[PDB]
Amino acid sequence: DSGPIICAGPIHSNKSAGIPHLLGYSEKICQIDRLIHVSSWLRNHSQFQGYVGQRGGRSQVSYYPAENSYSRWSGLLSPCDADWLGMLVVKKARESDMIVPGPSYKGKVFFERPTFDGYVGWGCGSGKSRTESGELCSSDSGTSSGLLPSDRVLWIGDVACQLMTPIPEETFLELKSFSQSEFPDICKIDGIVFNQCEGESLPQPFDVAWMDVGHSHKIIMREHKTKWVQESSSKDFVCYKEGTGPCSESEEKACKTSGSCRGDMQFCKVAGCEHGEETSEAKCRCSLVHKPGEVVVSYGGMRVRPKCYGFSRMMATLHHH
């Protein structure tokens, strides 16, 4: 199942240990492999002690729907992953945020859902997990260790996030109007005005393809083309020491700017390497992150590099007839 980007699943020794704010790119990626970011999210917004993902790491997270394409590429970023990298924010849920039907919420400590205007996460505190409906947290006699397995984390949707090419407002408004034309029946998505109706139906599950282009709200689509392009930027490479683990911020910068480290076929072509020197020792090696590339989306006569893209369940109100 997938596998980790750099760091194998954590074996935490203390639920009370602090989470260190790391600056290196590969340092942050390592924390992402070990679900340190979801644990940080749980401690912040829910008053939860410890970690999730013991021995499992990010690769053993559970998904809705369970069969997930982007799950198989360890290098594709979930909304939580991009949040840790500061590309977006997964907000704490409020009572108004609609919990969607279909996921198996029972025994889950955290779950996350992309909404029409953002990304929302639901947490549980120490000693508790979600009921069957997801509406509440209830006492869970298996969670008091504070060192919980990965499948207690639920990521809803088949999602890939990346560095976007920002687009001007004119592009977004045109993209906005095309989506309105493709979905004339819809009124509100996740409580946010999509069209003007006055005549709405009750909220209803809505599996839709969308994309984040870094504006007011997302852009949902029916007919679109997706293409994966390769870009070989430094963010496509992670650097590790054999034995030590992820390289520091300064060692990673040196590797990616000075052709002084070792790497695989792709890394040496991009930034350069040097062999014939390596004694016993151990310096930093940088390898390619396993992904199809960057996703580029054609829609409504346009073509964008979006912040996020995927097919996920949102809630929609329809036109009354």
Epitope: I11, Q54, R55, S141, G142, T143, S145, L147, L148, G243
Partner: antibody, heavy 121, light 108 residues
Framework: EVQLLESGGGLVQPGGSLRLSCAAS????????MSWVRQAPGKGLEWVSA????????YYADSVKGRFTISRDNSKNTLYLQMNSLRDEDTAVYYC??????????????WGQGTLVTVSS | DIQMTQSPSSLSASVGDRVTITCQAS??????LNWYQQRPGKAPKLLIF???NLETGVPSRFSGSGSGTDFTFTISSLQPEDIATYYC?????????FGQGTKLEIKR
């Protein structure tokens, strides 16, 4: 506060079977993985088996796989080890141990007093 | 799978002296090594976890270090109650394995 009390050891002839019990108190049994570790007379420590907090994951050393079974009753707060097809290399003091996590992790933070199993005719 | 070796097998030192025990793994286990003390007639007791962390209540004269395959357990100043056999244990793999043990005699 945390205490583990083994019982069920004794004489058994080769090919025989035994069930060991380990009664737990002073902690939330169902939240923690448990392990069995044994020690032959005059020898070192040998990890035998482990089980997750709920019992959905079991693990065994190759020396005992297929002959031993680990289980737990989280309402009675006791841990079990069913040992079948016993041999002379199984003669040892058997300890139960409390782990630090729901998932088997390998921190043997609390130990029972041990119970002796002797395999001879 | 992962085999653990301890040296020395036996060791004699007197009170106030420094004691160092080594433990090696056949593969990388990062810092996933624990140290146990088994006093005569008693069950083993966890002294250090994650190769360097003192368990609660363990005196500061106990210490450990190492990452990868080579590890060390140190008693800075021997005390008579330290008479025991000391075991290292890897937990990188779920199938946990112990070292063979180091027996510590107290000279007097």
């Amino acid at each position: 506060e945390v205490q583990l009390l083994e019982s069920g050891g004794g004489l058994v002839q080769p090919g025989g079977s035994l069930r060991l019990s380990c009664a737990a108190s002073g902690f939330i049994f169902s939240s923690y993985a448990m392990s069995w570790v044994r020690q032959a007379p005059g020898k070192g420590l040998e990890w035998v088996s482990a089980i997750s907090g709920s019992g959905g994951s079991t693990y065994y050393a190759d020396s005992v796989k297929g002959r031993f079974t680990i289980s737990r009753d989280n309402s009675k707060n006791t841990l079990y080890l069913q040992m079948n097809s016993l041999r002379d290399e199984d003669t040892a003091v058997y300890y139960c141990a409390k782990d630090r996590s729901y998932v088997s992790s390998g921190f043997f933070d609390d130990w029972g007093q041990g119970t002796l199993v002797t395999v001879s005719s | 799978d992962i085999q653990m070796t301890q040296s020395p097998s036996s060791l004699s030192a007197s009170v106030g002296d420094r004691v160092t025990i080594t433990c090696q793994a056949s593969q990388d286990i990062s810092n996933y090594l624990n140290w146990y003390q088994q006093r005569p007639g008693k069950a083993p007791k966890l002294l250090i976890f994650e190769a360097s962390n003192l368990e609660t209540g363990v005196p500061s004269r106990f210490s450990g270090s190492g990452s990868g395959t080579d590890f060390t357990f140190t008693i800075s100043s021997l005390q008579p109650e330290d008479i025991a056999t000391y075991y290292c244990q890897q937990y990188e793999n779920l199938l946990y394995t112990f070292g063979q043990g180091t027996k510590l005699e107290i000279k007097r």
